[PDB]
Design an enzyme around this catalytic site. Structure first.
Site: not given
Ligand SMILES: *CC(=O)CNC(=O)OCc1ccccc1
Ligand SMILES: *CC(=O)CNC(=O)OCc1ccccc1
Lengths: 299, 299
Positions: B39, B141, B143
């Site tokens: 993502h 940030g 993930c």
């Molecule tokens: C962890 C982050 O900083 C990058 N992603 C995030 O903030 O969430 C986005 C998302 C991912 C999966 C499902 C829905 C939203």
């Protein structure tokens, strides 16, 4: 959210195994120096009533078995530094980070790196208790384990482990060898003072509970600060200074919840109790989170 | 004694900052490969309903900003690996430990290394919930943060973080890119199943409480195992298999306390409640300690 210790990387490369006789414990290896508890020179029955400077005399440079993992280190000098044994070595640590020695004031938190023979086993965060004790995990051979903070990319060493008190609480020194509190490297009738709750921390954790969507314990109630301390004296809590109120400010300003309002919330929590409920998935009151390691967590 | 995560050292040298557009998240750098959530290629409003393979097409090797601390890495290839983005790089990781990828079975614990821009921030231990969720701390940030075990001196990667569910629970994948549970990298109506308590763990922690001099919850009461599971069905607990009983054996043999006796102790704790008391300084029942990270703790 959760209780989290500092990354252990920079400290891990500093852990060594200092063995003397049948005594084998951990040590910290910074530049061409290796620190460890001075009781490594002691034998089991010398912990009764020890004459450290006289025992230290029996010892010479060849009595120490410093082991950097598998590389055996040549000890070229020995000297006593209060309760710590300072060992000048051949080969200075190449992995040495930027470091500082600090003597953290009670209520302050740090990460411990648990070690059992000079290799790291696990890592967790605890807090320096008002009675100068620590609640960790230390079985045989864990003396030498260090405690630390990491600001920037700079390692602040602030604890080494020496002994467990016959109640399950842990005692040690800074990296100068000076004990926290009234304890001494000796197995005698050494009690621990009554512990009080780190009020400031409870408050900071309450803000984190609010940060995280848990706000049931709140009210339009406020408290004088002079009355709150009466409630604190009642429940073995530390009193609140204006200096505690001051840097709860940043946390107060974020959640728009006044500090005295939060004390009023606490005051009620202690007096009323509010049974069955959980704050951040816990019924107990959490005092091992300083304001600083709450702002830091988010974020 | 205390909840303790694994040393983070070996994983720390693997953390990198993978940025794509205005999207910036963590990544794991093993040999000449860099893993991260797929993502990162998405924009904020593409998380609504994402067409990953089609978005991935828009991207080319120059779209990725891999940063090993300060050394900027040259990405020489991109390919999708289920929910993870596999990035073949110029310069293979010199700090790479011996590693394995594992898909831990629910109830198993691991350490998380929280990261915010490819540098480690903190470290804590959690457990894979029966409903396949995790209770950690992850703000913007985070993930890319990984989960792992360290047996011997070997790093078993078993988690990467992808998303937070609109209830405050965390979801992710192994290092093959396959999700734990029924979740998908998408911001839609995605509920979490009801959580059950990891019975086996509660039992193991109870043994640790006995190890540590807390034995009030005990009795000469025993339970059939067939009846205990009825009590478990009542309190959202996982049932007990013979396989659970089997490697509680080593723990049983040390404390001389039979497993069925410990279930009888638990059975009572759930039914009666035993108010006011604390087990290892906690009123709540602790299910995030597997038998293995109890034997390991002592010692
Ligand atoms: C962890 C982050 O900083 C990058 N992603 C995030 O903030 O969430 C986005 C998302 C991912 C999966 C499902 C829905 C939203
Ligand atoms: C931590 C060790 O394994 C070495 N020391 C130890 O086990 O305790 C000895 C002791 C130190 C101080 C006071 C009393 C006893």
């Amino acid at each position: 959210f959760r209780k989290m210790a500092f990354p252990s990387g920079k400290v891990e490369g500093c852990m060594v195994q200092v063995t003397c006789g049948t005594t084998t414990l951990n040590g910290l290896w910074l530049d061409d120096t290796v620190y460890c508890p001075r009781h490594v020179i002691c034998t089991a029955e010398d912990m009764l009533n020890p004459n450290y400077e006289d025992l230290l005399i029996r010892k010479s440079n060849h009595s120490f078995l410093v082991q950097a993992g598998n590389v055996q280190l040549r000890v070229i000098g020995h000297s006593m530094q209060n309760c710590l044994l300072r060992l000048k070595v051949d080969t200075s640590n190449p992995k040495t980070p930027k470091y500082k020695f600090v003597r953290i004031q009670p209520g302050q938190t740090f990460s411990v790196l648990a070690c059992y023979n000079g290799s790291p086993s696990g890592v967790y965060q605890c807090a320096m208790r008002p009675n100068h004790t620590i609640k960790g995990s230390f079985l045989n051979g864990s003396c030498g384990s260090v405690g630390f903070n990491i600001d920037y990319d700079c390692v602040s060493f602030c604890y080494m482990h020496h002994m467990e008190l016959p109640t399950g609480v842990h005692a040690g020194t800074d990296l100068e060898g000076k004990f926290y509190g009234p304890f001494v490297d000796r197995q005698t009738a050494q009690a621990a003072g009554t512990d009080t709750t780190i009020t400031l921390n409870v408050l900071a954790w309450l803000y984190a509970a609010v940060i995280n969507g848990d706000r049931w314990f709140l009210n339009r109630f406020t408290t004088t600060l002079n009355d709150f301390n009466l409630v604190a004296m009642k429940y073995n809590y530390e009193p609140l200074t204006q200096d505690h109120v001051d840097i709860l400010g940043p946390l107060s300003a974020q959640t728009g919840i006044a500090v005295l309002d939060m004390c009023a919330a606490l005051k009620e929590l202690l007096q009323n109790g509010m049974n069955g409920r959980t704050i951040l998935g816990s019924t107990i009151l959490e005092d091992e989170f300083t304001p600083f390691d709450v702002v830091r967590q988010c974020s």
